[PDB]
Amino acid sequence: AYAEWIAVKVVVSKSIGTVGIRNATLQWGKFYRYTNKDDEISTEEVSSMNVQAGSPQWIASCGRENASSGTQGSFDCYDGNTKMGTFSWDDPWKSGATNTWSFTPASADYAGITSGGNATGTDIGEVTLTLGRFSEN
């Protein structure tokens, strides 16, 4: 249902400048143009986004309308040709089931720190993903 949704705000550090969103996939649900759940967009459109430092953009997904199912999927973040990592989520419809999400970095050269999100209830809601380039201290 539309009650199951996530919207990921992609924040790119000047340590990277531009992040390519690629390889988006869904096991359940659809992508949409935040904030209008009726405005469905293709996986290819999501997988063509370039996010610039200073101007965050949103990747949003919800369950299919009136269905007893939610949204589950992922997308990859790239710094040019170099994979930074993968953001994944699982927002089930079933009442009482835990909602989950994570960024998994490809290496210690990049980090994706998340803030926000509901582990319980219908929707994950808005989550911020802050991406940067890092070196060991």
GROMACS .gro file of C-alpha atoms in nm:
model
  137
    1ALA     CA    1   0.000   0.000   0.000
    2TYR     CA    2   0.092   0.366  -0.022
    3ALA     CA    3   0.126   0.359   0.360
    4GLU     CA    4   0.458   0.176   0.311
    5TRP     CA    5   0.710   0.426   0.179
    6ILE     CA    6   1.070   0.546   0.210
    7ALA     CA    7   1.228   0.866   0.080
    8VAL     CA    8   1.608   0.889   0.084
    9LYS     CA    9   1.765   1.234   0.079
   10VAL     CA   10   2.108   1.203  -0.086
   11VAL     CA   11   2.355   1.459   0.056
   12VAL     CA   12   2.689   1.473  -0.128
   13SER     CA   13   2.999   1.622   0.034
   14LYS     CA   14   3.230   1.855  -0.155
   15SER     CA   15   3.483   1.576  -0.083
   16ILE     CA   16   3.306   1.399  -0.376
   17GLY     CA   17   3.125   1.673  -0.572
   18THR     CA   18   2.895   1.447  -0.778
   19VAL     CA   19   2.743   1.107  -0.700
   20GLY     CA   20   2.590   0.885  -0.968
   21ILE     CA   21   2.285   0.684  -0.858
   22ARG     CA   22   2.301   0.358  -1.053
   23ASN     CA   23   2.173   0.001  -1.059
   24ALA     CA   24   1.845   0.071  -0.880
   25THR     CA   25   1.630  -0.238  -0.822
   26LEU     CA   26   1.306  -0.331  -0.648
   27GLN     CA   27   1.186  -0.662  -0.509
   28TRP     CA   28   0.856  -0.501  -0.399
   29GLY     CA   29   0.698  -0.164  -0.471
   30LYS     CA   30   0.762   0.117  -0.717
   31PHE     CA   31   0.976   0.429  -0.741
   32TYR     CA   32   0.803   0.766  -0.749
   33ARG     CA   33   0.887   1.134  -0.786
   34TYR     CA   34   0.882   1.259  -0.426
   35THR     CA   35   0.641   1.357  -0.286
   36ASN     CA   36   0.367   1.234  -0.525
   37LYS     CA   37   0.313   0.858  -0.493
   38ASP     CA   38   0.103   0.857  -0.815
   39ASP     CA   39   0.398   0.987  -1.021
   40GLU     CA   40   0.577   0.659  -1.085
   41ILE     CA   41   0.926   0.673  -1.234
   42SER     CA   42   1.122   0.392  -1.393
   43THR     CA   43   1.420   0.214  -1.245
   44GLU     CA   44   1.619   0.350  -1.541
   45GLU     CA   45   1.531   0.710  -1.451
   46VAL     CA   46   1.634   0.657  -1.088
   47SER     CA   47   1.952   0.488  -1.220
   48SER     CA   48   2.040   0.797  -1.427
   49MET     CA   49   2.041   1.057  -1.148
   50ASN     CA   50   2.353   1.260  -1.069
   51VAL     CA   51   2.342   1.435  -0.729
   52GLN     CA   52   2.559   1.745  -0.676
   53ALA     CA   53   2.711   1.872  -0.353
   54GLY     CA   54   2.496   2.147  -0.205
   55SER     CA   55   2.175   2.040  -0.385
   56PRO     CA   56   2.037   1.720  -0.232
   57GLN     CA   57   1.792   1.505  -0.426
   58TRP     CA   58   1.545   1.241  -0.313
   59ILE     CA   59   1.492   0.877  -0.412
   60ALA     CA   60   1.147   0.762  -0.306
   61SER     CA   61   0.968   0.429  -0.319
   62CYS     CA   62   0.632   0.303  -0.194
   63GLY     CA   63   0.419  -0.009  -0.199
   64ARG     CA   64   0.179  -0.068  -0.484
   65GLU     CA   65  -0.155   0.102  -0.431
   66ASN     CA   66  -0.409  -0.102  -0.230
   67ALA     CA   67  -0.175  -0.403  -0.208
   68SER     CA   68  -0.089  -0.599   0.106
   69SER     CA   69   0.282  -0.550   0.034
   70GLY     CA   70   0.540  -0.280   0.086
   71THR     CA   71   0.866  -0.163  -0.070
   72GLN     CA   72   1.203  -0.336  -0.077
   73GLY     CA   73   1.496  -0.252  -0.300
   74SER     CA   74   1.836  -0.091  -0.338
   75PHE     CA   75   2.048   0.152  -0.536
   76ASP     CA   76   2.422   0.197  -0.581
   77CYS     CA   77   2.625   0.516  -0.534
   78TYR     CA   78   2.921   0.589  -0.762
   79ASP     CA   79   3.200   0.847  -0.758
   80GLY     CA   80   3.268   0.850  -1.131
   81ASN     CA   81   3.376   0.496  -1.222
   82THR     CA   82   3.435   0.398  -0.856
   83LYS     CA   83   3.163   0.223  -0.657
   84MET     CA   84   3.102   0.389  -0.320
   85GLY     CA   85   2.846   0.143  -0.184
   86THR     CA   86   2.483   0.032  -0.184
   87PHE     CA   87   2.177   0.166  -0.003
   88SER     CA   88   1.913  -0.101   0.068
   89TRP     CA   89   1.577  -0.102   0.247
   90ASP     CA   90   1.292  -0.335   0.344
   91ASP     CA   91   0.961  -0.173   0.442
   92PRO     CA   92   0.712  -0.459   0.487
   93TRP     CA   93   0.337  -0.420   0.492
   94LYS     CA   94   0.277  -0.677   0.767
   95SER     CA   95   0.186  -0.510   1.096
   96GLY     CA   96   0.450  -0.564   1.362
   97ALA     CA   97   0.728  -0.652   1.118
   98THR     CA   98   1.049  -0.455   1.150
   99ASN     CA   99   1.149  -0.205   0.881
  100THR     CA  100   1.520  -0.197   0.793
  101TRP     CA  101   1.761   0.008   0.583
  102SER     CA  102   2.136   0.045   0.548
  103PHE     CA  103   2.427   0.179   0.350
  104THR     CA  104   2.701  -0.075   0.289
  105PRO     CA  105   3.029   0.091   0.183
  106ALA     CA  106   3.237  -0.073  -0.089
  107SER     CA  107   3.554   0.020   0.104
  108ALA     CA  108   3.676   0.253   0.376
  109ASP     CA  109   3.738   0.524   0.113
  110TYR     CA  110   3.371   0.631   0.130
  111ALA     CA  111   3.108   0.640   0.401
  112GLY     CA  112   2.732   0.682   0.390
  113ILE     CA  113   2.589   0.787   0.726
  114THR     CA  114   2.212   0.761   0.767
  115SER     CA  115   1.979   0.960   0.990
  116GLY     CA  116   1.607   0.927   1.045
  117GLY     CA  117   1.377   0.642   0.955
  118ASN     CA  118   1.111   0.442   1.140
  119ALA     CA  119   1.201   0.086   1.240
  120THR     CA  120   0.836   0.020   1.334
  121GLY     CA  121   0.502   0.099   1.178
  122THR     CA  122   0.385   0.124   0.821
  123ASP     CA  123   0.648   0.351   0.665
  124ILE     CA  124   1.021   0.400   0.697
  125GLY     CA  125   0.962   0.762   0.595
  126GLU     CA  126   1.235   1.016   0.526
  127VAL     CA  127   1.598   0.903   0.572
  128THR     CA  128   1.903   1.121   0.506
  129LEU     CA  129   2.207   0.956   0.343
  130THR     CA  130   2.521   1.170   0.385
  131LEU     CA  131   2.806   1.060   0.156
  132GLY     CA  132   3.172   1.156   0.186
  133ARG     CA  133   3.527   1.053   0.097
  134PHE     CA  134   3.749   0.951   0.387
  135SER     CA  135   4.107   0.861   0.477
  136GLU     CA  136   4.238   0.680   0.782
  137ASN     CA  137   4.326   0.917   1.067
   0.00000   0.00000   0.00000
